[PDB]
Amino acid sequence: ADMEVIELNKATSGQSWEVILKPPSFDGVPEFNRDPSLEEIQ
Amino acid sequence: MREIVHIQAGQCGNQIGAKFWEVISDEHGIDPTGSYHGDSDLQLERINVYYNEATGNKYVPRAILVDLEPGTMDSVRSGPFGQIFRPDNFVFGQSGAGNNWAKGHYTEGAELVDSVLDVVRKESESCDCLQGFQLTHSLGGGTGSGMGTLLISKIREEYPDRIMNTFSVMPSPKVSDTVVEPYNATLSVHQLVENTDETYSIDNEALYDICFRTLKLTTPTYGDLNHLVSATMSGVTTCLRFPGQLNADLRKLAVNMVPFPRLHFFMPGFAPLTSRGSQQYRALTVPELTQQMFDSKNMMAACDPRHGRYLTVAAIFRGRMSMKEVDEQMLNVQNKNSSYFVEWIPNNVKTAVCDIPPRGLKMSATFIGNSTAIQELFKRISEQFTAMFRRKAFLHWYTGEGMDEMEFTEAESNMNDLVSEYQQYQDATADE
Amino acid sequence: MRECISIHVGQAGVQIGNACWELYCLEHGIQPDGQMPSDDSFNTFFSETGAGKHVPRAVFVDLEPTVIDEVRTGTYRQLFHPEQLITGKEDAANNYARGHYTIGKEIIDLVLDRIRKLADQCTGLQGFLVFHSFGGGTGSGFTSLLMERLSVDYGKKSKLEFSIYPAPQVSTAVVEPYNSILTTHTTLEHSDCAFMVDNEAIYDICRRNLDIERPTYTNLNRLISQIVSSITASLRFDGALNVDLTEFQTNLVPYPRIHFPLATYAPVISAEKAYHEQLSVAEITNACFEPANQMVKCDPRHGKYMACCLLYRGDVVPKDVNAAIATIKTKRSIQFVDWCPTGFKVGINYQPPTVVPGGDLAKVQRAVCMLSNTTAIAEAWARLDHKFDLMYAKRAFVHWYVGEGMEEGEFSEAREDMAALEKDYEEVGVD
Numbered sequence: 001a002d003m004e005v006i007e008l009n010k011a012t013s014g015q016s017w018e019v020i021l022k023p024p025s026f027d028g029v030p031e032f033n034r035d036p037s038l039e040e041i042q
Numbered sequence: 043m044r045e046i047v048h049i050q051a052g053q054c055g056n057q058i059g060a061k062f063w064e065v066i067s068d069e070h071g072i073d074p075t076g077s078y079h080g081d082s083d084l085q086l087e088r089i090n091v092y093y094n095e096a097t098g099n100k101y102v103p104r105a106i107l108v109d110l111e112p113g114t115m116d117s118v119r120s121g122p123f124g125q126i127f128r129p130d131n132f133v134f135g136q137s138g139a140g141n142n143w144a145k146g147h148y149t150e151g152a153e154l155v156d157s158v159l160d161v162v163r164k165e166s167e168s169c170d171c172l173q174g175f176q177l178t179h180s181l182g183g184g185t186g187s188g189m190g191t192l193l194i195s196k197i198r199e200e201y202p203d204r205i206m207n208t209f210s211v212m213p214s215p216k217v218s219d220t221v222v223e224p225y226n227a228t229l230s231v232h233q234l235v236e237n238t239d240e241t242y243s244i245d246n247e248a249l250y251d252i253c254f255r256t257l258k259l260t261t262p263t264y265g266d267l268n269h270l271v272s273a274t275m276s277g278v279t280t281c282l283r284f285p286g287q288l289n290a291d292l293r294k295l296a297v298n299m300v301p302f303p304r305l306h307f308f309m310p311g312f313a314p315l316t317s318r319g320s321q322q323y324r325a326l327t328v329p330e331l332t333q334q335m336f337d338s339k340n341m342m343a344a345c346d347p348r349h350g351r352y353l354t355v356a357a358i359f360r361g362r363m364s365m366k367e368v369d370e371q372m373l374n375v376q377n378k379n380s381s382y383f384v385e386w387i388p389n390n391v392k393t394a395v396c397d398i399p400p401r402g403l404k405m406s407a408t409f410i411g412n413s414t415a416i417q418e419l420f421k422r423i424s425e426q427f428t429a430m431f432r433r434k435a436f437l438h439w440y441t442g443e444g445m446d447e448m449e450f451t452e453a454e455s456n457m458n459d460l461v462s463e464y465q466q467y468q469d470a471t472a473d474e
Numbered sequence: 475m476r477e478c479i480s481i482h483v484g485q486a487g488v489q490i491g492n493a494c495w496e497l498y499c500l501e502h503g504i505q506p507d508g509q510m511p512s513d514d515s516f517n518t519f520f521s522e523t524g525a526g527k528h529v530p531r532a533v534f535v536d537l538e539p540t541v542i543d544e545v546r547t548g549t550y551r552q553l554f555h556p557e558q559l560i561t562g563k564e565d566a567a568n569n570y571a572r573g574h575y576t577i578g579k580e581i582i583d584l585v586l587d588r589i590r591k592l593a594d595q596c597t598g599l600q601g602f603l604v605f606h607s608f609g610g611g612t613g614s615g616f617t618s619l620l621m622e623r624l625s626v627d628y629g630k631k632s633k634l635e636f637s638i639y640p641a642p643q644v645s646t647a648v649v650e651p652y653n654s655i656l657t658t659h660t661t662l663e664h665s666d667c668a669f670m671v672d673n674e675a676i677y678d679i680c681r682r683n684l685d686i687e688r689p690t691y692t693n694l695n696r697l698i699s700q701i702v703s704s705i706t707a708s709l710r711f712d713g714a715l716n717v718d719l720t721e722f723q724t725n726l727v728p729y730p731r732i733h734f735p736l737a738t739y740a741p742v743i744s745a746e747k748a749y750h751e752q753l754s755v756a757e758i759t760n761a762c763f764e765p766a767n768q769m770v771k772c773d774p775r776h777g778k779y780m781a782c783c784l785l786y787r788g789d790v791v792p793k794d795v796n797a798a799i800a801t802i803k804t805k806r807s808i809q810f811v812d813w814c815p816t817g818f819k820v821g822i823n824y825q826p827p828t829v830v831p832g833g834d835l836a837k838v839q840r841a842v843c844m845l846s847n848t849t850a851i852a853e854a855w856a857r858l859d860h861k862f863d864l865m866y867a868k869r870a871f872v873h874w875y876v877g878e879g880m881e882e883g884e885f886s887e888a889r890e891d892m893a894a895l896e897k898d899y900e901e902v903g904v905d
């Protein structure tokens with residue numbers, strides 16, 4: 001029944017926001033998982 | 043990819059080639075003067091694949107007519123569409139090949155080859171984007187067979203990156219004009235395995251059997267056999283000469299049809315089977331057209347497709363029909379006949395539908411199969427060859443031209459390797 | 475000003491481009507000659523000439539001229555300047571090696587010179603949108619060659635793809651699995667975000683929802699164009715979500731390689747149908763979680779979400795949206811990975827979906843496009859990889875690529891990279 005929403009913007013044609021129903025379960029940034037140049041290509 | 047350069051070599055090559063040009067000219071609405079008199083924009087959309095546009099409304103076949111004998115050329119010029127051909131494109135010798143592969147490949151043929159290449163170069167340099175070459179010839183004769191394969195090798199040397207396609211007619215004892223046909227065929231097959239990208243194996247054994255057994259023609263003539271050849275040639279070239287998504291050019295056809303370089307010998311099929319006189323006929327629905335794909339009775343190569351497995355298949359449906367019905371019927375055949383398609387080449391059956399039916403029919407179907415069953419045709423030639431070669435019969439006709447026995451042994455061995463290669467993929471499993 | 479350059483490669487790319495640009499013109503009121511009798515955001519996609527004509531910021535490339543020749547003879551021949559429609563003579567013949575090496579190497583410098591001329595007209599170039607098929611030799615081979623060169627010339631500039639995943643119902647080559655794996659391997663490190671469009675999913679939507687017995691590319695592309703327009707509407711109109719190309723990446727891409735979002739669109743309604751009740755926000759939102767409305771065939775219930783974007787268009791109110799999301803959570807699990815919040819980023823763009831007059835799609839008051847990064851998309855890679863393996867075990871058709879200068883080792887490398895990609899989707903979903 002409870003939920004969180006985070007308002008972002010509003011414009012000529014827009015209005016966006018976040019929604020959170022079940023927050024991150026581990027806490028913190030993602031923890032799981034060249035070049036070239038022209039010479040390298042040729 | 044646009045222009046195809048067509049070459050016609052020998053008696054058979056010129057006879058079948060002339061019929062091809064009258065059949066396709068009629069489909070594209072071109073009369074014997076070169077003028078377009080049709081009433082459909084589809085007829086002209088890809089006209090440039092086979093015809094050069096000359097000054098004004100006229101269309102000229104991009105065809106080179108070759109023979110070591112003059113008579114056949116005269117017969118072509120005298121013909122219905124004989125006047126459509128470029129006069130400068132008739133290249134003929136005076137000294138024939140006498141149904142001797144050695145004369146066609148090494149002696150007389152070698153003397154005429156440069157005059158032919160000069161005409162093919164003229165046609166090729168005129169091209170915006172040459173796809174490659176299409177050769178019609180017999181394998182049982184001397185010119186079509188020996189000179190035809192010499193031309194393939196000389197053309198391959200100058201245009202190594204172009205597609206080399208042939209319509210090669212296989213000899214048969216049932217409709218034989220010479221006792222040495224097994225030698226001429228074996229020597230030619232050796233050349234084709236190495237030098238062509240795609241070969242349509244047109245078997246006189248199968249054409250005779252269709253005429254005699256199915257068309258009930260007691261004594262079949264070359265005219266009767268050629269009616270089946272021209273229907274097949276029209277069918278297999280449909281994708282190249284009309285707007286379409288599948289196999290629209292010689293290279294895309296080869297890429298879809300040839301999984302291994304040497305296995306480029308196709309078994310053509312056609313439905314419905316008709317005789318020159320039969321302008322009846324009242325028949326042929328979509329399920330009926332589809333069923334004749336596995337029908338050995340409808341094969342232009344004397345092989346039973348149920349004796350092997352299809353590596354790749356191209357099926358062309360012609361006439362006004364449901365694309366939904368075609369797709370359903372085609373899927374049904376693959377599901378019901380699972381065992382006759384290799385499991386290690388996914389979605390190996392490609393279908394195309396062309397609104398324009400061939401002449402005389404409202405509905406038709408053409409099949410192009412790369413089947414392991416084609417080994418039956420090569421086995422037949424090898425056994426006929428060995429029966430003669432074991433006793434060195436008629437060998438003096440070839441050694442007399444400067445040939446060595448080793449060439450015979452090599453050609454035979456290469457053809458038997460081809461048979462062994464087809465058998466290998468017939469027995470291969472998706473155990474992966 | 476934040477300009478976006480659109481690149482259309484091969485038949486699929488060019489034909490989808492025709493559908494997209496036709497739709498953009500209808501949305502912005504631009505006529506086929508570039509004239510408009512007039513928000514201002516459309517300038518990100520259309521430049522303006524001295525005569526008040528609006529020209530797409532796009533390049534159309536094909537190795538064969540047939541397809542593009544239709545654009546230069548067609549209704550929109552005046553929309554594009556001739557120099558932005560580039561064609562060769564010889565196609566890649568459904569061969570990645572021909573497209574990438576043999577034929578591609580001849581036209582690459584010319585294509586990049588045209589792209590450079592378009593980029594010179596930009597004050598704040600955001601990056602590129604690349605449309606191509608996986609299956610064709612140009613679509614596969616030329617695209618990966620171009621993507622590599624674009625990374626060199628346009629250092630840390632955003633590149634997004636609209637990739638046509640092959641389907642047997644509409645497939646033209648037996649070698650499409652080879653071309654698909656070769657292009658995916660080579661392009662992976664050069665693309666920021668790629669939206670795959672499975673031709674079978676589109677074929678089935680046209681058959682099921684639009685009652686088209688035998689869907690044509692024209693039918694498929696019109697539907698594709700609607701999804702592309704939904705993704706690009708917030709760049710071309712003053713939107714709030716996915717406002718710039720960098721925002722697509724930020725919102726949907728948690729790891730560099732896992733950059734393949736699943737698109738789901740609703741509603742898809744037949745035009746030749748009796749007047750019906752307009753769908754509510756709840757109804758269209760429910761439709762986003764139905765596998766039948768997906769752009770790629772796969773099962774999200776068997777996967778885990780890592781990001782979800784809901785892009786609404788037309789008569790939509792935030793209260794309606796939140797109520798719809800709340801009811802969905804009560805009935806559906808909607809499982810997210812441990813390290814991600816269970817949530818949605820929602821965007822509303824006020825313009826209702828525009829449809830092509832005489833088209834198969836009905837005009838609706840409101841529509842929605844959900845872009846979700848799910849591990850279930852790995853199922854699409856697995857299907858492709860298996861078909862590759864079947865043929866590759868026998869080296870079937872390999873000679874065609876080797877003959878063009880490719881090495882057999884490139885096939886092994888491409889397949890190993892795909893195995894690592896499948897492994898990445900598996901590792902990402904673990905906890």
Ligand SMILES: Nc1nc2c(ncn2[C@@H]2O[C@H](COP(=O)(O)OP(=O)(O)OP(=O)(O)O)[C@@H](O)[C@H]2O)c(=O)[nH]1
Nearest residue numbers: 484485486489565566567568607609610611612613
């Ligand atoms: N959705 C969609 N798919 C298409 C279209 N045209 C081709 N395809 C698909 O793309 C694949 C064929 O590749 P193409 O784009 O036609 O070929 P190409 O890029 O021009 O490359 P080459 O012709 O080999 O030089 C198959 O999977 C087709 O189903 C189109 O207009 N729409």
Ligand SMILES: Nc1nc2c(ncn2[C@@H]2O[C@H](COP(=O)(O)OP(=O)(O)O)[C@@H](O)[C@H]2O)c(=O)[nH]1
Nearest residue numbers: 052053054057180182183184185186213217264
């Ligand atoms: N189908 C068909 N086969 C032919 C025709 N003419 C000859 N043949 C066959 O071709 C072989 C003889 O070769 P031919 O082309 O006459 O000799 P060439 O002039 O030296 O090439 C034999 O297998 C004949 O049965 C023809 O018009 N049609």
Ligand SMILES: [Mg+2]
Nearest residue numbers: 485538565610
């Ligand atoms: Mg193409």
